[PDB]
UniProtKB/Swiss-Prot annotation, chain A:
Disease annotated for this entry: Cornelia de Lange syndrome 6: A form of Cornelia de Lange syndrome, a clinically heterogeneous developmental disorder associated with malformations affecting multiple systems. It is characterized by facial dysmorphisms, abnormal hands and feet, growth delay, cognitive retardation, hirsutism, gastroesophageal dysfunction and cardiac, ophthalmologic and genitourinary anomalies. CDLS6 inheritance is autosomal dominant. A chromosomal aberration involving BRD4 is found in a rare, aggressive, and lethal carcinoma arising in midline organs of young people. Translocation t(15;19)(q14;p13) with NUTM1 which produces a BRD4-NUTM1 fusion protein.
Linked residues for Glycyl lysine isopeptide (Lys-Gly) (interchain with G-Cter in SUMO2): 58
Species this protein is from: Homo sapiens
Similarity comment text for this entry: Belongs to the BET family.
Domain commentary: The NET domain mediates interaction with a number of chromatin proteins involved in transcription regulation (NSD3, JMJD6, CHD4, GLTSCR1 and ATAD5). The C-terminal (CTD) region mediates interaction and recruitment of CDK9 and CCNT1 subunits of the P-TEFb complex. It is also required for maintenance of higher-order chromatin structure.
Tissue: Ubiquitously expressed.
Miscellaneous comment text of the record: JQ1, a thieno-triazolo-1,4-diazepine derivative, and I-BET, a benzodiazepine derivative, have been tested on tumors with success. Treatment with GSK1210151A (I-BET151, a I-BET derivative) has strong effets on mixed lineage leukemia and promotes myeloid differentiation and leukemia stem-cell depletion.
Protein name as catalogued: Bromodomain-containing protein 4
Subunit structure, interactors included: Interacts with p53/TP53; the interaction is direct. Interacts (via CTD region) with CDK9 and CCNT1, acting as an associated component of P-TEFb complex. Interacts with RELA (when acetylated at 'Lys-310'). Interacts (via NET domain) with NSD3, CHD4, BICRA and ATAD5. The interaction with BICRA bridges BRD4 to the GBAF complex. Interacts (via NET domain) with JMJD6 (via JmjC and N-terminal domains); the interaction is stronger in presence of ssRNA and recruits JMJD6 on distal enhancers. Interacts with NSD3. Interacts with NIPBL. (Microbial infection) Interacts with bovine papillomavirus type 1 regulatory protein E2. This interactions may serve for the tethering of viral genomes to host mitotic chromosomes allowing successful partitioning of the viral genome during cell division.
Lineage: superkingdom: Eukaryota
Swiss-Prot record, chain B:
Residues of the full protein shown: 44 to 167 of 1362
Cross-link position per record: Glycyl lysine isopeptide (Lys-Gly) (interchain with G-Cter in SUMO2): 57
Note: JQ1, a thieno-triazolo-1,4-diazepine derivative, and I-BET, a benzodiazepine derivative, have been tested on tumors with success. Treatment with GSK1210151A (I-BET151, a I-BET derivative) has strong effets on mixed lineage leukemia and promotes myeloid differentiation and leukemia stem-cell depletion.
Domain writeup: The NET domain mediates interaction with a number of chromatin proteins involved in transcription regulation (NSD3, JMJD6, CHD4, GLTSCR1 and ATAD5).
Gene coding for it: BRD4
Name by which UniProt lists this protein: Bromodomain-containing protein 4
C-alpha cells in the first residue's frame, strides 16, 4: 500500500548534452502541458496512500509524472529526445492502464496526449 | 455546493416543432456533442468535485450541452434564438471563468467556431 520512491532524476554516471530538441521539450512541451487546466493529476507522482489507491503500484510498475520529467530535463538525465518522449508516453499509457475507457481522468490524459503530439509535431530538427 | 441544474421543462409554455429547432438538435447538438473537445461542456461543471469554490460565484448563468439537449427534447424553446443564446452562454461562461489563451478557452473557441459553421446552415425561419 506504500508508495515507491519517485523515479530517479539525476544520473551522475551518464554524459550530458544540450540540444535544440531537449531545450524545446522543457521550454515548450513540458511548460505547455504543465499549465494546461487538466495537468494537476499528472504533475507529481501518484500518492496512492493519500488518494486511497492500494492497488495503484501493484498495477503500475513504471510510474511517471510531469514533475519527474521536468527534473530529468533540468538535470540532463536524457541524452536522446526520444527518452523524454517515451516518459511522456509512459505517463499517458499508465493512465489508460489503471483506469477504464471513458473515465474523466482518462479523458483528461487523452487531451494532454493530443496536445503533446501537436507540440512534438513541431520538435526542432535533430 | 453546486446549484441545481438549469430547468429543462416548462409546463406552462406552449410548444412547437420547427425546421430550425429540429436542426439544432439533430445536427448542431449532435455535431458538437461528438467533438473531441466537448466532454468538459457536456454536463454542468461539478465545482464540488473539482474544488472550484469560486465557479458559481463567478458563473451566475451556468449552461452546458446536456441542458441544451434536454431543453430541445422537451420543447422548452419556442424560438431558435433562445437555443442559440444558450450555446453562446456556454461559450462565454468559459471565457469569463478562465483567462485569454487558457487551453480550456482554446477548446471552447474551437467548439464555438464549429457551432457558428453549423448555424450558418440553419434552415430559414
Amino acid at each position: 500500500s506504500m508508495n515507491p520512491p519517485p523515479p530517479e532524476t539525476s544520473n551522475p554516471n551518464k554524459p550530458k548534452r544540450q540540444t535544440n530538441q531537449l531545450q524545446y521539450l522543457l521550454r515548450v512541451v513540458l511548460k505547455t502541458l504543465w499549465k494546461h487546466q487538466f495537468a494537476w493529476p499528472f504533475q507529481q507522482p501518484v500518492d496512492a496512500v493519500k488518494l486511497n489507491l492500494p492497488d495503484y503500484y501493484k498495477i503500475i510498475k513504471t510510474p511517471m509524472d510531469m514533475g519527474t520529467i521536468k527534473k530529468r530535463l533540468e538535470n540532463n538525465y536524457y541524452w536522446n529526445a526520444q527518452e523524454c518522449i517515451q516518459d511522456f508516453n509512459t505517463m499517458f499509457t499508465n493512465c489508460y492502464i489503471y483506469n477504464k475507457p471513458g473515465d474523466d481522468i482518462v479523458l483528461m490524459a487523452e487531451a494532454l496526449e493530443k496536445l503533446f503530439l501537436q507540440k512534438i509535431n513541431e520538435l526542432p530538427t535533430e
